[PDB]
Amino acid sequence: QLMEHLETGQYKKREKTLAYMTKILEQGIHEYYKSFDNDTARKMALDYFKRINDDKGMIYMVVVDKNGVVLFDPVNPKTVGQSGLDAQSVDGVYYVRGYLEAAKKGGGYTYYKMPKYDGGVPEKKFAYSHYDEVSQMVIAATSYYTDINTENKAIKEGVN
Template sequence: MKLIASLFAALVLFASSSPAPAADKGTKPEAVAMVKKAVDAIKANGADKAYALFAKTDGGFRDRDLYVLVYDMSGTCLAHGANPKLVGKNNLEAQDADGVYYVKDRLALAKTNASFWQDYKYTDPVTKKIEPKSTYCEKLNQTIVCVGIYK
């Protein structure tokens, strides 16, 4: 009986120390849906009002690790739901932990695709760790509207 109680206690301890469930992270369908919602907000309210909503934690465009980012075709960040310090900065030369020029790559993909997925590494706003990221983007006029998921 003591052995069963010990095994049960070990199982409970193991279960409580395991990583957070996948439900705590955004999914590909949720990222696509948020991009479409963001594009609709830009079209309905204009860029300035929509970008202000993207920056607010309670603006309807933040969900767990999901947030909206918008770049223009020169590599300047127009909106960033997780890091407002990037707004207004040209990030064309930004590299991820593996040396990938992810903004340059994003611009190149946007020149030939109306929508696309892009993989690189970026700091997860929830865990604060550099994680593999897959970002869904749609081109809207001369901008790229994106939401990424952390793997």
């Protein structure tokens, strides 16, 4: 029981962390939008997000526009430039609809399974999404439960 409630607490904490990280990443890309033309600023934002995903660390970004067109998702590269409104995860979640619904509420969460990389084994994850009015993008910061558990392994072993 201790472990169960601890794990749940760690996941809830990470949810809040993703909301904060999304805020600071938005503030970062606002520098691009203030100083470069629209098309260049968006290129810079998505190239940055590629660099974040390539780091294979705490978070992985996904980006869609307000109408659900996929702008960035290296796990599903063929979806880029297409409507994602009918896209489903392998566990049957309309993940882009979830991003949009959360953003319409001022920010929120979507839960679904997806690989960590194109062609990989699907794993449970979640997304915090938010509509950035400067870039006019719905930005999603995402984390995998496997990774959260890895990061918390030493805490878990210490309690044991």
